[PDB]
Amino acid sequence: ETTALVCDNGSGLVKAGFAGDDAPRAVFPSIVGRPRHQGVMVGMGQKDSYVGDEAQSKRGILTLKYPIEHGIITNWDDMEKIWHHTFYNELRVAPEEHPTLLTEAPLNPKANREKMTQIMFETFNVPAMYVAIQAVLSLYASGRTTGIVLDSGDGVTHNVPIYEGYALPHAIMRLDLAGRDLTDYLMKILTERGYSFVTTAEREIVRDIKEKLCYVALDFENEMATAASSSSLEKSYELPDGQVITIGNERFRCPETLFQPSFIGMESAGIHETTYNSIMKCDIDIRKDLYANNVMSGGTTMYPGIADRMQKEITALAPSTMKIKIIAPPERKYSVWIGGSILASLSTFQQMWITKQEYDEAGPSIVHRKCF
């Protein structure tokens, strides 16, 4: 008949597709490029701005901007460009025909949801839409009705405890540390080894190094001793120009800053300790069921060894008698989209959509009451 679009704007990757199917069929970075050099050749078809995979391909001559920083949309028309590119170019579906489902982090400004709604109804004319909390969707993904979701993308990290389908909003933790700022830290520690990546195109190279070579040290101290004492730990990577760069202790030293934010300079404790401090804000009858499920979600939790490091230090904090289990499905990079794919195909959900009538009656204010 008609099958809802399920669209996750994230930071970095947009990933979008139709509801009721197994994986996204559009995944591309939410990046918008503008040319910065002088156009010399006449008659080239030179084009105002590039979006997604184009801006990645041409990035040598572009400034690349991300329109979402820390799950807040900061530039609105670059965001409209990204949605326009998703529906018309990637999915090739006219949005008037499909309900749309949109995804957001908790405890972010209301104006963000209002603008998302006003755009989807007025300029796309989407017939109905909804805005869902990223953390809630990862439990639909992993097939659970209980757990504490630890989710980290580019930008925002957040913990949301859920118990039998009730969120416990007083216990939500949000932390701005994750993902992008690991990359900006990685650039400063690489500078110490004598490589300098400044421009916005060079950051994309750093980000790919981070995805290939970084891993979480199980004990941070012993590995700094080891890498100081040896070359066995050291791996080398080849830049797009065929230079080769060599990285030692630093590759584990980068993701350690998730567990000790002091390095980058933030106030708060690491993800292990906001997770534990989130379980401690819950009433005592349910803690035993939260420790039994910790569900990782989003790509910043894909470093090798991060599950085992979490299980170790949460076990060190927690009371002795209990099972601490960490659930880290190998597919977790997509879990928010897979969960939204499930949710938008339920029939119970077909009453939940904000339909265009209710918007025309009550305006963008409705989102706050009708959605969570």
Binding site: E69, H70, I72, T74, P109
Partner: peptide
Amino acid sequence: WXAXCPA
């Protein structure tokens, strides 16, 4: 953001 942070 609007205050306590750049976005």
